[PDB]
Amino acid sequence: MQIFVKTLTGKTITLEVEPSDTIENVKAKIQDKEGIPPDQQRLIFAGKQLEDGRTLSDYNIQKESTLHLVLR
Ligand SMILES: [Zn+2]
Ligand SMILES: [Zn+2]
Ligand SMILES: [Zn+2]
Ligand SMILES: [Zn+2]
């Protein structure tokens, strides 16, 4: 599954993931791409705040879905 993560500046990160990847796994991948620490990352998909220990398929994230890094 290819997904897109937009940073707070709107830069697109493209990631290759599996349905069972956790959000914590996705935060690690974002750290590798952009140097953003996982504990500073907050992700949203379709208005939903994404929890570290749940999976992409738990949130119905699919091929070409876009997630956003946001502020609290
Ligand atoms: Zn894939
Ligand atoms: Zn696998
Ligand atoms: Zn994985
Ligand atoms: Zn795996």
Side-chain angles (χ1 to χ4, degrees), residues 43-71:
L43 288 165
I44 297 304
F45 168 67
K48 297 185 301 198
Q49 299 184 354
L50 315 183
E51 291 177 328
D52 287 357
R54 289 283 127 234
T55 71
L56 301 180
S57 57
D58 294 333
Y59 292 113
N60 238 94
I61 288 169
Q62 290 191 324
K63 295 154 80 70
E64 320 277 284
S65 288
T66 294
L67 291 196
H68 287 286
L69 284 160
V70 296
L71 310 180

Side-chain angles (χ1 to χ4, degrees), residues 6-69:
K6 289 184 174 323
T7 68
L8 278 157
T9 66
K11 179 177 176 178
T12 297
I13 295 174
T14 297
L15 294 179
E16 178 57 23
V17 293
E18 290 197 280
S20 78
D21 272 303
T22 48
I23 297 297
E24 187 167 16
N25 289 353
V26 168
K27 290 184 178 176
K29 290 175 196 287
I30 287 169
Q31 184 183 29
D32 285 352
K33 284 272 183 178
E34 298 293 321
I36 304 170
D39 62 11
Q40 281 201 82
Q41 295 177 40
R42 184 183 189 274
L43 288 165
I44 297 304
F45 168 67
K48 297 185 301 198
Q49 299 184 354
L50 315 183
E51 291 177 328
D52 287 357
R54 289 283 127 234
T55 71
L56 301 180
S57 57
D58 294 333
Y59 292 113
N60 238 94
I61 288 169
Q62 290 191 324
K63 295 154 80 70
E64 320 277 284
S65 288
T66 294
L67 291 196
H68 287 286
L69 284 160

